[PDB]
Amino acid sequence: RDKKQKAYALFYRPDVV
């Protein structure tokens, strides 16, 4: 398991404008 990505998942957003 990847702790960093598990954490990032809570607030991930794509590169949109």
Epitope: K3, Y8, F11, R13
Partner: antibody, heavy 123, light 107 residues
Framework: EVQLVQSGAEVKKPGESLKISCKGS????????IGWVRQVPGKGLEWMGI????????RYRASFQGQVTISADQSSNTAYLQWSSLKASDTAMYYC????????????????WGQGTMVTVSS | YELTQPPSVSVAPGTTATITCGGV??????VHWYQQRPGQAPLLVIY???DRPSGIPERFSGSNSGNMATLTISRVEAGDEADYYC??????????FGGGTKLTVLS
Amino acid sequence: EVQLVQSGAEVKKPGESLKISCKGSGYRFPSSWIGWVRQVPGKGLEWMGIIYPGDGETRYRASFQGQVTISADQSSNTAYLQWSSLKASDTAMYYCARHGRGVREVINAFDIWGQGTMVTVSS
Amino acid sequence: YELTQPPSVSVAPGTTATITCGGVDIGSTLVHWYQQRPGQAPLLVIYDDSDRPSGIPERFSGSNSGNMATLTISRVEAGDEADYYCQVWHSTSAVIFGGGTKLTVLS
């Protein structure tokens, strides 16, 4: 240079409305979260909400739901925090801060902070 | 969900300062640490448990595990005294700061 510049100090009375702003400079504004943090003078930091301007996604702490509104405008690179009916307890400093979008190429934390806006609500 | 910090911590110059942040299973998520000086906006000093921003000196480091995270300042200098806050992203709608800790470097 990456920078967040907030609006000047505010002195309001209870029951009034207010809208303070935080402008980003030196980076691509839509591709980073901007969060708002409250700090009563001499007390700790309290997180209120956060907004991603790219798609406008907005989250609030459960306490502040219906108490404030967070917004953003990409054409002007500006996030906003607004009260409809200010109350004395809202007196505090307010910071805006940039937070990464959950990717390794960026810092996924409040890596940049505005200088803060002092809001004084007294009758 | 609360993060528990000690209100105040004092250490001698040139020694190691440690500030502790307590949270339920805090070791499962990432912990960040911010330094705030009187009259100034916070400054990210450590992110993702132990990472240092480019400008921060190597004296700052972080740890996280179980129900305890830690900020460690080695060879602490007088200039380092300030308020320090731990912070995590617990739930989707809840970002949580610690109560804050006042660090004094004994003079």
